Design a protein around this motif. Structure first.
Motif, short mmCIF file in Angstrom:
data_model
loop_
_atom_site.label_atom_id
_atom_site.label_comp_id
_atom_site.label_asym_id
_atom_site.label_seq_id
_atom_site.Cartn_x
_atom_site.Cartn_y
_atom_site.Cartn_z
N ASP A 1 -124.86 -145.57 14.62
CA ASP A 1 -123.42 -144.89 14.57
C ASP A 1 -122.99 -144.79 16.08
O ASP A 1 -122.16 -144.17 16.31
CB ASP A 1 -124.07 -143.39 14.25
N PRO B 1 -120.03 -147.73 6.35
CA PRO B 1 -120.02 -146.18 6.65
C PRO B 1 -121.26 -145.51 6.02
O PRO B 1 -121.74 -144.60 6.38
CB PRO B 1 -118.53 -145.71 6.46
N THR C 1 -124.23 -146.28 8.31
CA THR C 1 -123.92 -145.75 9.72
C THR C 1 -123.82 -144.37 9.72
O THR C 1 -124.28 -143.62 10.76
CB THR C 1 -122.85 -146.44 10.29
N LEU D 1 -119.30 -142.30 12.89
CA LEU D 1 -119.63 -142.73 14.10
C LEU D 1 -119.59 -141.57 15.16
O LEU D 1 -118.93 -140.82 15.12
CB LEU D 1 -118.65 -143.86 14.51
N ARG D 2 -120.31 -142.02 16.27
CA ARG D 2 -120.43 -140.75 17.33
C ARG D 2 -118.92 -140.62 18.09
O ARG D 2 -118.33 -141.59 18.21
CB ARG D 2 -121.52 -141.06 18.40
#
Ligand SMILES: [Cu+2]
Ligand SMILES: [Cu+2]
Ligand code: NA
Ligand code: NA
Ligand code: NA
Ligand code: NA
Lengths: 620, 620
Positions: free
Chosen positions: A616, B199, B202, B205-206
């Motif tokens: 991520d 996605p 993952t 996302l950060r």
């Protein structure tokens, strides 16, 4: 409100008052150590009790004391008189650093030795050196320092360039008596200076270095709350400071989705020793426990922005006690910042056509200490991918001697007539493990080579074997670089999605351990340094691998006594002690001031996560 | 004007024309390797002759050729027909990467194996894998590739997540015949995807990473002249590029006052091999010489500013030949930049009162290559203090297999039903040494422990011993981490101001060497990988530790044949070959894309300078 918060000035002032009111801090008393105690196991009570441990020296010759105080309740919990011939002397006091030189300056034997060498006593610096335990029966139960001399030609001169060899003295610092002066012969005092700021030695300074600017225009990615609690890129921890150990990391955990998963309960460098390998009687007693005898935390430097720490820096300023119980701030003593760390993961795929690159970064927590000639940087690193790393950076000025005419098997020549004895710098990391909780075990993992034959007809197979360490008596381990040996700390009660126990792998640098003869005094006093890895069962009072009172302790305290209990360590609350060090044969390039050399270790996840933990991370 | 300049597009076009006019580059010919030759010993003639070496493959079955061409004079210097059953096959061609899959798609045995597994042939990717030399007599003198299959569920799918185990095929790529199809049984194809940009895998996302800005407002401190000549902080060198080896460093020298002092004449990674340790007949033949069989330089990535290289970056764009002799630019294939590297030297002195801090920096020269599933970064570092360091960064996607029900001693489980075979990544660094000139020798240095006794009464002494390697037959050495073993390259005819020979010390990481049985095919073909250090006498034609033609070579070429000459290496023009590598037991955290792991070596000055070489660094 956190029990792991740094000591405050107010707490230290209250300790002072409690000790004073109890009659324990009169004019003849000195505080040799003061530190906060960690919470006991089972802190889920929220009933805070901030307790401090104090070692109290008496300059008049009375017995020293160990005292525990509750600042929350304003009470003395316990006070015990110490028999130092039995359990060891207290750490060296900063105020004793000048006492050795002052006492020798009035001793007729010392003066006659300097007179023969035509040395002005006003120019002779004497290093205050810990004594160890050797053949001198009169030293048992006495507080002894030894002195070696160095000439300063002028106030800003580097005395290390001018050792006075063939001469050593022993001093009782409480009775203020010089017990022995030993003069084995006259060596020329090396005459070249070692002044690394003198233009005659540096030459013209370079004008070729252009600036590197490292900035964070949106500020750093970590947050600091409660004074010393860090959150950064799924990591969570508390940064402590102790005057003996220096920076201590508490409650290292990683936020994996919705769960905060513990990894390490407490991480510290719990001892460090510098044994010298020169057999000359002038120096053959030299073994400096920079942590246990001198206390590295009290000599932490104030770190300058742009010089010591570069980038967007957040400082902590820890508070310690002086010898009278007054609080003293080490301004900017700890630097914290994040650093770019190159490529994290990269792949360009021939079949999918996808090109993928992500960058790594690390969080840095560091401090620098100075003990006489040595300067050491202690660095802890947390990486995006779950790796934890420690690095020690050794610099300063090498400890010098004369270089004998005709050479030496144990001393390097640095300049005309100037030598540097061989030595080691050996560290002990104490890792109170908590991999997904406190039920942990250690496995030793070796590569296994296989013979060509049935089931391996082409002779290509290789494998690995893991051996569980089940009892403390079998948990004293040696490195084996040739077989790729590592150690895995796992939790047998916590499994990943493939039903394997979660774990972390310790990767050592596999440097030599203690070189001294196993019958030597230093091998007995620094037994931890003779083996690469020890595992013990956790116990509140088992804090240091060398025991509580290292100075002039006769030996065998600490780890060899602990493991004799032969406790169960197979799925229990355990502590890993890792020995690692530098073996230093000084080179000409180390003089007159030494470029940094490094040593350390790292821990990497080994099936702790269910897949890569950095999927991520965004694309910069 | 420098003979070490990068190949130009014009030079490659002239080579094309010379070969074409000489009748050597007809429609059935392919260039498998093309590179510039280094100047011969004694280049102080200024008579430049740019020569290129070419390997020419013939797709119709005629014998391949080795050709040397002078572009300066427009002439063919030599052309030799190769008997590949004797001396080895030519490196794998990029255009052969798709041929294995295409030939198998029409073979009835392959189709029947896919039909049993209900796999659509249009979805099956076949890796083009080098063949080695095993038991198949029909392969001698034939150009063979082996194929292993992976399923792509859709065009952007990661095929590595879906290995087809129990199935392997061998193909003659010149005659276009499938020689063998081996089907040992049906394994389930692992069904989970490994799409690290999906996605669903993952997660979100950060949003926590704040930018780190690294800039140089006055530009970099290094200069680039003549296209590839670097000057930086007293270092001087030329950056070359070869399609087989990648980045090559030439003429590494250090300006010490008024003198330019050579250190290394040529530094390169001259081979790298990935042996697999799975005894299954589906994979027990797998040993990929990424350098010698595939040529790592031709697959160098174009590096993106901000993602691959961060800071003030200077790029080189090397030119290589395609298979028809056309020049092809690798845009932004080499990154060069300087990096802050923390504290260089630090001391706060108790007697002089002087506080001193200096910062370190390093020059970085790097490139990244992709070979199938692997991606490797090659980094060379030059430090202010004279240290030279190499680091390899391994990432990409691990090579997969099925995970057998009931487990495996030679394969790690990564996901349900998905395995990754154990393997190593082993490098050979070729260091053509020139410490203060070409008269060099190698000494092996071991720590020496001493017994307590007369002359060592306290049992503290330790020492070191140095053994000169005088002949090639005694210069094949093994690591010994426990005794702190290092190797010193010195110049016995060049002394420092203390009358000691100048030198540099090689520090290895002491990782395991080749694990395969010594009777195996890979131990014979990769003999260099069985020992940590080799020293040979320099010779023009002794370029690679595995010989010139590694593909399908039966073994023993390269270093074992060279050292049989038993030449004098005591104060002579010598070459050090250092083996170093990673032993990879894949972990769950390596999937679906692997975080970088690293391995390398370094060289530090050892009495090369008369004192620290960084006294003239200014105070930031
Ligand atoms: Cu040292
Ligand atoms: Cu690997
Ligand atoms: Na005792
Ligand atoms: Na524990
Ligand atoms: Na052959
Ligand atoms: Na050479």
């Amino acid at each position: 409100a956190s029990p792991f918060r740094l000591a405050s000035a107010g707490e230290i002032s209250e300790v002072q008052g409690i000790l004073r009111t109890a009659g324990l801090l009169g004019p003849e008393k000195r505080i040799a150590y003061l530190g906060v105690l960690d919470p006991a196991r089972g802190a889920g009570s929220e009933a805070e009790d901030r307790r401090f441990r104090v070692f109290i020296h008496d300059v008049s010759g009375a017995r020293p004391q160990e005292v525990t105080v509750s600042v929350t309740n304003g009470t003395v919990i316990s006070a015990v008189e110490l028999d130092t011939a039995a359990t060891g002397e207290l750490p060296v006091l900063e105020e004793e650093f000048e006492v050795v030189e002052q006492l020798l300056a009035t001793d007729e034997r010392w003066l006659k030795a300097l007179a023969a060498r035509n040395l002005d006593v006003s120019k002779v610096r004497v290093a205050p050196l810990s004594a160890g335990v050797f053949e001198y029966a009169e030293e048992r139960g006495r507080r002894i320092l030894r002195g070696l001399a160095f000439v300063q030609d002028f106030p800003e001169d580097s005395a290390w360039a001018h050792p006075v060899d063939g001469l050593v003295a022993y001093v009782d610092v409480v009775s203020k008596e010089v017990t022995r002066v030993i003069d084995t012969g006259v060596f020329p005092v090396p005459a070249e200076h070692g002044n690394y700021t003198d233009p005659e030695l540096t030459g013209p300074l370079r004008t070729t270095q252009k600036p590197i600017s490292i900035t964070q225009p949106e500020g750093p990615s970590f947050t600091v709350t409660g004074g010393n609690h860090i959150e950064w890129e799924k990591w969570s921890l508390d940064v402590g400071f102790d005057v003996r150990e220096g920076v201590v990391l508490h409650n290292i955990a990683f936020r994996d989705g919705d769960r905060l998963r513990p990894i390490i309960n407490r991480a510290s460098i719990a001892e460090m020793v510098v044994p010298y390998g020169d057999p000359s009687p002038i120096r053959s007693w030299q073994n400096y426990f920079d942590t246990g005898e001198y206390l590295v935390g009290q000599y932490a430097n104030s770190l300058e922005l742009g010089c010591d720490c570069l980038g967007d820096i957040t400082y902590l300023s820890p508070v310690i006690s002086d010898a009278f119980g007054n609080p003293r701030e080490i301004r900017n003593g700890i630097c914290m910042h994040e650093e770019d760390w190159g490529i994290l993961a990269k792949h360009s795929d021939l079949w999918s056509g996808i090109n993928y690159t992500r960058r790594n970064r690390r969080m840095v927590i560091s401090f620098f200490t100075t003990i006489g000639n040595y300067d050491y940087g202690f660095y802890w690193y947390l990486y995006l991918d779950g790796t934890i790393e420690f690095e020690a950076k050794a610099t300063g000025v090498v400890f010098t001697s004369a270089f004998p005419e005709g050479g030496s098997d144990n001393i390097s020549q640095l300049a005309p007539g100037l030598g540097a004895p061989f030595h080691q710098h050996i560290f002990s990391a104490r890792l109170d493990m908590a991999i997904d909780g406190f039920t942990n075990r250690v496995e030793e993992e070796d590569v296994v080579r296989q013979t060509m034959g049935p089931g391996n007809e082409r002779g290509n197979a290789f494998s690995r074997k893991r051996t569980v360490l089940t009892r403390e008596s079998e948990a004293v381990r040696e490195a084996d670089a040739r077989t790729g040996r590592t150690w895995i700390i796992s939790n047998p009660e916590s499994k990943n999605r493939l039903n394997e126990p979660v774990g972390y792998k310790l990767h050592a640098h596999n440097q030599p351990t203690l070189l001294a003869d196993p019958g030597s005094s230093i091998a007995r006093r620094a037994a931890f340094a003779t083996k690469d890895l020890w595992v013990t069962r956790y116990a509140d009072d088992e804090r240091y691998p060398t025991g509580d009172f290292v100075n002039q302790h006769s030996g065998g305290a600490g780890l060899p006594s602990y493991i004799a209990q032969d406790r169960d360590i197979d799925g229990q609350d355990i502590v890993v002690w890792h020995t690692f060090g530098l073996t230093h044969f000084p080179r000409v390039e180390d003089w007159p001031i030494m470029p940094v050399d490094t040593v350390g270790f790292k821990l990497r996840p080994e099936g702790f996560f269910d897949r890569s933990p950095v999927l991520d991370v965004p694309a910069n």
